[PDB]
């Protein structure tokens, strides 16, 4: 019958590894590099679009940085279509929580929820896992500014600075070298762009190949503002930091 | 090589099970032809009764789907009847829901969509048949719409199906290249049937008796099949000029 054609997506290897998770991680390593850096006065999300064209409409384009709510954003590395399925689910969870408790969802609770959905596809259902790794940048009044990552296994961890996608080994070493705890957003903006500039597989880092975002308490007084940078604004910050 | 067993893509982007269903289409070794008149649509098909123990009246590949729509099938009879029953059910349901007779092109599209599903869903196999739907539509007039195992469909001025479809197709192409019109300019369906039979004789290079053919005719508000004696009268007229 049908058994003959079943790949069995949710089985252990003899070494105790999940084949499909490992192969999904291999897929993600070819995606554009995304970087998150957490500072005392905000978080930076920087990400590289994959080998683009001059005819691509950049100002209306979004493949890397997505808004989950007013306090939480994600950087994507992997299959964009898979990511949008999960992103929509995350957006709904946030709203469910807000409706239930009349408070914005704490960052970790949202992250755990999406991570549990990913986990389910590795243990039951016989379907392929989502070929996506997220960087979550967010703020709540319990822990303040937070960075997380999740991968196709459904495992998630917290970070001060982190990369996903291509050349994470080189990127993580560079971040580990120049990151300090008392760092500020403007310094983190510079570190993120410098790291991408060195790890990129392209010849040069330009505005049309980047997506950029900041989560700041640089919102007038006791509140948080998300800023998805426009193409011209990415061009300006590249000149300001002295990369172009 | 299980990409050849179920309807999934091969490395070339091909669906082999669909391609092999097209090959099953010619298993009966029967050729069919359809043409349009002014007021009618005619479909003729070869009739072969190889066993003397068979009841020849029950051997048929032309179906009366609805009052207005007829269907000839190229392929094995089990799949043919499968498609026939479904088409009949779809046509009846349409009339009930929407309050008017299902058009020939709409039925063709519906059956084509069902076929498309078999090429995408793994548990269902394609039907090894090509379905030619004929009618005189109340909006579009004489109509020929043909469906295949790939889920493709299109309207035709005239068409041919079977092992020797190319010979019939080229013969029909050459006639319409002369006349420069999209139909047989004839008043009576009787003469359109005579045209259809004549051009099949020319294309295949074979003579026909009354039992070697099967004929379906679509007029305004009804589709019907001809008896052996009706076909005989047609064959006599062809021979007498």
């Amino acid at each position: 019958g049908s058994r003959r054609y079943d790949s069995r997506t949710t089985i252990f290897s003899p070494e105790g590894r999940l084949y499909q998770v490992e192969y999904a991680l291999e897929s993600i390593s070819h995606a554009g590099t995304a970087i998150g850096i957490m500072a005392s006065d905000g978080i930076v999300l920087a990400a590289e679009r994959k080998v683009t064209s001059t005819l691509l409409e950049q100002d209306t384009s979004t493949e890397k940085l997505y808004k989950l709510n007013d306090k939480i954003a994600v950087a994507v590395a992997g299959l964009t279509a898979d990511a949008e399925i999960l992103i929509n689910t995350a957006r709904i969870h946030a709203q469910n929580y807000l409706k239930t408790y009349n408070e914005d969802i704490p960052v970790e609770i949202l992250v755990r929820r999406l991570s549990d959905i990913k986990q389910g596809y590795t243990q039951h259902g016989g379907l392929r896992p989502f070929g996506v790794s997220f960087i979550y940048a967010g703020y709540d009044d319990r822990y303040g500014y937070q960075l997380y990552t999740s991968n196709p296994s459904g495992n998630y961890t917290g970070w001060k600075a982190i990369s996903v996608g291509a050349n994470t080994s080189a990127a993580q070493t560079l971040l580990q070298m120049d990151y300090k705890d008392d760092m500020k957003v403007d310094d983190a903006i510079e570190l993120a762009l410098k790291t991408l500039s060195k790890t990129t597989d392209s010849s040069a880092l330009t505005y049309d190949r980047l997506e950029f975002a900041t989560i700041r308490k640089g919102a007038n007084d006791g509140e948080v503002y998300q800023k998805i940078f426009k193409p011209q604004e990415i061009k300006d910050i590249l000149v300001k930091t002295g990369i172009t | 090589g299980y990409d050849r067993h179920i309807t999934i893509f091969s490395p070339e982007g091909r669906l082999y099970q669909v391609e092999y269903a097209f090959k099953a289409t010619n298993q009966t070794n029967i050729n069919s032809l359809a043409v349009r008149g002014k007021d009618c649509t005619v479909v003729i098909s070869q009739k072969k009764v190889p066993d003397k123990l068979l009841d020849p009246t029950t051997v048929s590949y032309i179906f009366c789907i609805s009052r207005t729509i007829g269907m000839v099938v190229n392929g094995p009879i089990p799949d043919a009847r499968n498609a026939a029953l479904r088409a009949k059910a779809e046509a009846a349901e349409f009339r009930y829901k929407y309050g008017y007779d299902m058009p020939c092109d709409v039925l063709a599209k519906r059956m084509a969509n069902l076929s498309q599903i078999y090429t995408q869903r793994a548990y269902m196999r394609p039907l090894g048949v090509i379905l030619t739907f004929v009618s005189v539509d109340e909006e579009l007039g004489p109509s020929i719409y043909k469906t295949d195992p790939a889920g493709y469909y299109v309207g035709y001025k005239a068409t041919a199906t079977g092992p020797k479809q190319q010979e019939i197709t080229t013969n029909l192409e050459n006639h319409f290249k002369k006349s420069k019109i999209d139909h047989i300019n004839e008043e009576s369906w009787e003469k359109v049937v005579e045209f259809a039979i004549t051009h099949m004789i020319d294309a295949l290079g074979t003579e026909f008796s009354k039992n070697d053919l099967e004929v379906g005719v679509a007029t305004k508000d009804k589709f019907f099949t001809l008896s052996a004696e009706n076909i005989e009268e047609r064959l006599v007229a062809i021979a007498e000029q």
């Binding site: - | 009366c64 789907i65 609805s66 029953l85 009949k88 059910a89 046509a91 009846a92 349901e93 009339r95 009930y96």
Partner: protein, 196 residues
Amino acid sequence: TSIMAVTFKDGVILGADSRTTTGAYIANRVTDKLTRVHDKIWCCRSGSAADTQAIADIVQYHLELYTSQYGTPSTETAASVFKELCYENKDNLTAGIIVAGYDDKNKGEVYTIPLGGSVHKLPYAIAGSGSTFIYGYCDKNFRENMSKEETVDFIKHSLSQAIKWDGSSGGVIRMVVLTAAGVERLIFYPDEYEQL
């Protein structure tokens, strides 16, 4: 409503008034209560208009699908399909249907399906609110193997009286003749039948 169907020598004729009321208001004075479910199988409807229309539409669908597979259905088969719907859904229906049809083998046949969903094959049938007033007249005047002209007169006179006494019945008398020759519609206006 006043409806009837009468078998005769050459086949069967269905007859009906044209009045549809909502209480004492005549919502439609030119209603067509003679309904085609197949070429030569028609029916007369009484009871809930919504129910009898819904039933008739389903039957027409069933007989259309029957015809595509098995050829022309018998009048008995049509009556059976009506009965199946009426009997199985008796709790949620208010429908009194007379089924009339012409076969070549069986000729004219009439089946009546009252409220409960039972079936009764009869030489002729009367139904609707107005039928109560013509049981006496119809029983006294019906003969088997009447001519077309006699049957038209019998139905015309019968429904004339039903209309006269029943406030729920009125308008025109519609008739549909079912024979080997085909299907003929007839209509008779108040100025004609009121003077009978």
